[PDB]
DNA sequence: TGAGGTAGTAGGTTGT
DNA sequence: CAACCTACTACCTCG
């Protein structure tokens, strides 16, 4: 079905013919920079020309005039002083048809909205982000309300704004004040001289005149002795974690720092309706366009079309997964389940008993419940009873207890995991009419003993779907994938992730962590898929999927490689009506927006945004088909992910491995989706 | 640890 | 600089 919608986009005034001639200007460093220093360097110098310059080619477009520039100067990087010289090289007419002109056009563009909102008073300016006024307030802190914008050229030389409205949380108090107002020691801390922030530990309360330091001065004079006292008192000490040592505690003062403030230091939601978000978008960007000189913003349409809403299957039609517990589910087997109790009583909970019973007998298989007597603070015995019960034939356990500290949560969890037993948290204060809830975790229990809950009916280009994406916080990541396999994702299976320096995946680990997905649809299905559907989490490095790509081709087997970003998709607002789910939109080539999750009372929904970087399926069946996996999420009861479920699985792996460890994986199923 | 959503907070990687 | 990502917590509501 046609449609139409709004982007949170608008039309502005033609650039004159000053801007679609800029300047020009040839860039001499002394002494010429290295091969790793040569492009950060060059943007330095954009920025210290002044005026409204970017970098073009090896050199720089300017909206300025040189003689407005700073065309000699000094630049600081990494510890080594640059002298810098420009040369102006004439102006010269920029085409915004050409791409790459229009490119160049587009930056000046951005610069220009940077130095524009500069000089714009009384309000809050941050970069790109504007904040007009005050939302709400406390002892101590305020809610500020304003947009987060961009500028750019489109390709009939007009400007093009992008407005979407935010909030912003300020703390305009010292970590001294802020806790003599009986508020708890904040997570997070920043300097009060400077940007940078540590993490709080604790209040150290020993004397800061007495408090020696690594060499030699006191804390209280070594801040002293730097010029941080004048115009303040120093405090109490504080005990801040290193950014790069975990293992060494530094001091600090807390007269000298600021908490930095999340909704967890402060009962108000910041979400807005997409009614209200549209109207505050709008007012925005008239109120910007004038101010700014950029004439009257006209609302930019495109056009939409609304896919097929998905037919989810249990043991017959769902509309939601925890469906599945009465009426059945999709692929049932002979299970057995353990009960731990960390909480002081006794058996299962009757109606948890009950609803599990009900489930098996929908599904038509047979259920085995037991109960793990042992404790895990009886240490190494406690794993002989776990090993007991993998032998009695228990695939996963059901573990109720006081919430735990993240710690022992973690810590739990591997000792289990070391013995293939995935693990389902449920916290103890328990009432059965919290239905949502338990329910919820027994279908986080069931997936992780590799059971089907359900499965998709339609036709898809391709069997086998798999998700990459990159998780952990150390200096090092995982690069994983998790798949699903067969024509209705009737199989979910993840694969052992590896060990990466970064957010790139190495080529062979790309191509063996899909051969893995090959294989296992190998297994399932008794030959190779004619088709496979590759999702990326976020952009897709350089040549990341070559390897992999090639090898696919010389199997014969067909792909669609899809870039899925969870942001940069802009807002989407119906031009007329309800805003409906499963939107897709088409935008440039190979490119498109595809908003898969919104339901009334909701905030603005914000749509993935989809780069279609190999393969030749047509954009409207991959979005289709994308839509449609979002939907076979098996652990969420009553709300779908907004990713589809081979990447919403891979998230959720990667996030695992970065908080356990990859070493307790062995002898965990790949059926068993442990992490979700 | 119930889960997803949309929110906010901080910091990080890729690559001209 | 680019245009995205990580991962935490809060409230709302339960396709
Ligand atoms: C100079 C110095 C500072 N510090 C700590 C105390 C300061 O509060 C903290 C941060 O100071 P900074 O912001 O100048 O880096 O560094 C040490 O632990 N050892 C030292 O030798
Ligand atoms: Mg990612
Ligand atoms: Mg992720
Ligand atoms: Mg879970």
């Given at each position: 079905?046609?449609?139409?919608?709004?982007?949170?986009?608008?039309?502005?005034?033609?650039?004159?013919?000053?801007?679609?001639?800029?300047?020009?200007?040839?860039?001499?460093?002394?002494?010429?920079?290295?091969?790793?220093?040569?492009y950060?360097?060059?943007?330095?110098?954009?920025?210290?020309?002044?005026?409204?310059?970017?970098?073009?080619?090896?050199?720089?477009?300017?909206?300025?005039?040189?003689?407005?520039?700073?065309?000699?100067?000094?630049?600081?990087?990494?510890?080594?002083?640059?002298?810098?010289?420009?040369?102006?090289?004439?102006?010269?007419?920029?085409?915004?048809?050409?791409?790459?002109?229009?490119?160049?056009?587009?930056?000046?563009?951005?610069?220009?909205?940077?130095?524009?909102?500069?000089?714009?008073?009384?309000?809050?300016?941050?970069?790109?982000?504007?904040?007009?006024?005050?939302?709400?307030?406390?002892?101590?802190?305020?809610?500020?309300?304003?947009?987060?914008?961009?500028?750019?050229?489109?390709?009939?030389?007009?400007?093009?704004?992008?407005?979407?409205?935010?909030?912003?949380?300020?703390?305009?108090?010292?970590?001294?004040?802020?806790?003599?107002?009986?508020?708890?020691?904040?997570?997070?801390?920043?300097?009060?001289?400077?940007?940078?922030?540590?993490?709080?530990?604790?209040?150290?309360?020993?004397?800061?005149?007495?408090?020696?330091?690594?060499?030699?001065?006191?804390?209280?004079?070594?801040?002293?002795?730097?010029?941080?006292?004048?115009?303040?008192?120093?405090?109490?000490?504080?005990?801040?974690?290193?950014?790069?040592?975990?293992?060494?505690?530094?001091?600090?003062?807390?007269?000298?720092?600021?908490?930095?403030?999340?909704?967890?230091?402060?009962?108000?939601?910041?979400?807005?309706?997409?009614?209200?978000?549209?109207?505050?978008?709008?007012?925005?960007?008239?109120?910007?366009?004038?101010?700014?000189?950029?004439?009257?913003?006209?609302?930019?349409?495109?056009?939409?079309?609304?896919?097929?809403?998905?037919?989810?299957?249990?043991?017959?039609?769902?509309?939601?997964?925890?469906?599945?517990?009465?009426?059945?589910?999709?692929?049932?087997?002979?299970?057995?389940?353990?009960?731990?109790?960390?909480?002081?009583?006794?058996?299962?909970?009757?109606?948890?008993?009950?609803?599990?019973?009900?489930?098996?007998?929908?599904?038509?298989?047979?259920?085995?419940?037991?109960?793990?007597?042992?404790?895990?603070?009886?240490?190494?015995?406690?794993?002989?009873?776990?090993?007991?019960?993998?032998?009695?034939?228990?695939?996963?356990?059901?573990?109720?207890?006081?919430?735990?500290?993240?710690?022992?949560?973690?810590?739990?969890?591997?000792?289990?995991?070391?013995?293939?037993?995935?693990?389902?948290?449920?916290?103890?204060?328990?009432?059965?009419?919290?239905?949502?809830?338990?329910?919820?975790?027994?279908?986080?229990?069931?997936?992780?003993?590799?059971?089907?809950?359900?499965?998709?009916?339609?036709?898809?280009?391709?069997?086998?779907?798999?998700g990459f994406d990159a998780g952990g916080?150390?200096?090092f990541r995982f690069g994983g994938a998790?798949?699903?396999?067969?024509?209705?994702?009737?199989?979910?299976?993840?694969?052992?992730?590896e060990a990466q320096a970064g957010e790139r995946i190495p080529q062979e680990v790309v191509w063996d962590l899909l051969?893995?997905?090959?294989?296992?649809?190998?297994?399932?299905?008794?030959?190779?898929?004619?088709?496979?559907?590759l999702l990326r989490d976020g952009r897709v490095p350089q040549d990341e999927f070559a390897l992999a790509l090639e090898?696919?081709?010389?199997?014969?087997?067909?792909?669609?490689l899809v870039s899925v970003r969870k942001?940069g998709?802009?807002?989407?607002?119906?031009?007329?009506?309800?805003?409906?789910?499963?939107?897709?939109?088409?935008?440039?080539?190979?490119?498109?927006?595809?908003?898969?999750?919104?339901?009334?009372?909701?905030?603005?929904?914000?749509?993935?945004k989809l780069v279609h970087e190999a393969?030749?399926?047509?954009?409207?069946?991959?979005?289709?088909?994308?839509?449609?996996?979002?939907?076979?999420?098996?652990?969420?009861?009553?709300?779908?992910?907004?990713?589809?479920?081979?990447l919403?699985?891979a998230?959720?792996?990667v996030?695992?491995?970065?908080?356990?460890?990859?070493?307790?994986?062995?002898?965990?199923?790949?059926?068993?989706?442990?992490?979700?």
């Open positions: 079905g046609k449609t139409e919608v709004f982007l949170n986009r608008f039309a502005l005034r033609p650039l004159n013919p000053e801007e679609l001639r800029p300047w020009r200007l040839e860039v001499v460093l002394d002494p010429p920079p290295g091969r790793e220093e040569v950060p360097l060059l943007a330095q110098v954009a920025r210290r020309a002044g005026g409204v310059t970017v970098r073009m080619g090896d050199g720089l477009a300017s909206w300025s005039p040189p003689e407005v520039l700073v065309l000699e100067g000094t630049l600081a990087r990494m510890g080594q002083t640059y002298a810098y010289r420009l040369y102006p090289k004439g102006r010269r007419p920029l085409d915004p048809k050409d791409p790459g002109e229009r490119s160049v056009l587009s930056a000046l563009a951005r610069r220009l909205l940077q130095e524009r909102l500069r000089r714009l008073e009384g309000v809050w300016v941050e970069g790109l982000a504007v904040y007009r006024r005050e939302h709400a307030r406390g002892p101590g802190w305020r809610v500020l309300g304003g947009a987060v914008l961009d500028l750019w050229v489109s390709d009939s030389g007009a400007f093009l704004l992008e407005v979407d409205p935010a909030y912003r949380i300020l703390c305009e108090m010292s970590l001294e004040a802020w806790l003599a107002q009986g508020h708890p020691l904040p997570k997070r801390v920043r300097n009060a001289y400077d940007r940078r922030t540590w993490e709080l530990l604790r209040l150290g309360e020993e004397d800061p005149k007495e408090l020696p330091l690594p060499g030699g001065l006191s804390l209280l004079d070594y801040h002293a002795s730097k010029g941080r006292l004048q115009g303040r008192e120093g405090g109490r000490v504080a005990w801040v974690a290193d950014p790069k040592d975990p293992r060494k505690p530094i001091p600090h003062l807390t007269g000298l720092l600021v908490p930095v403030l999340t909704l967890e230091d402060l009962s108000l939601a910041l979400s807005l309706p997409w009614e209200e978000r549209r109207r505050r978008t709008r007012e925005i960007a008239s109120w910007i366009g004038r101010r700014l000189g950029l004439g009257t913003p006209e609302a930019v349409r495109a056009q939409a079309y609304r896919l097929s809403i998905p037919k989810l299957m249990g043991r017959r039609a769902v509309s939601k997964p925890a469906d599945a517990l009465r009426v059945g589910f999709y692929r049932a087997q002979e299970t057995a389940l353990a009960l731990l109790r960390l909480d002081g009583a006794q058996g299962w909970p009757e109606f948890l008993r009950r609803a599990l019973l009900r489930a098996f007998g929908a599904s038509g298989a047979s259920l085995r419940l037991h109960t793990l007597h042992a404790h895990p603070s009886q240490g190494l015995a406690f794993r002989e009873a776990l090993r007991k019960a993998k032998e009695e034939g228990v695939q996963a356990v059901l573990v109720l207890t006081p919430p735990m500290a993240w710690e022992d949560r973690n810590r739990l969890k591997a000792l289990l995991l070391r013995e293939g037993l995935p693990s389902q948290i449920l916290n103890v204060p328990l009432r059965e009419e919290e239905r949502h809830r338990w329910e919820n975790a027994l279908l986080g229990l069931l997936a992780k003993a590799g059971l089907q809950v359900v499965a998709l009916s339609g036709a898809y280009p391709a069997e086998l779907a798999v916080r150390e200096s998790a798949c699903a396999v067969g024509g209705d994702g009737g199989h979910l299976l993840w694969t052992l992730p051969e893995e997905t090959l294989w296992a649809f190998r297994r399932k299905a008794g030959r190779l898929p004619s088709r496979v559907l090898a696919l081709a010389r199997e014969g087997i067909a792909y669609d942001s998709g802009g807002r989407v607002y119906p031009v007329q009506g309800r805003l409906a789910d499963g939107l897709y939109v088409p935008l440039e080539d190979k490119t498109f927006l595809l908003l898969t999750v919104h339901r009334d009372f909701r905030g603005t929904p914000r749509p993935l393969g030749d399926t047509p954009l409207e069946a991959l979005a289709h088909q994308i839509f449609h996996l979002t939907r076979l999420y098996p652990a969420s009861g009553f709300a779908f992910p907004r990713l589809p479920a081979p919403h699985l998230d959720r792996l996030k695992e491995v970065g908080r356990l460890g990859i070493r307790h994986l062995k002898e965990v199923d790949r059926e068993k989706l442990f992490f979700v």
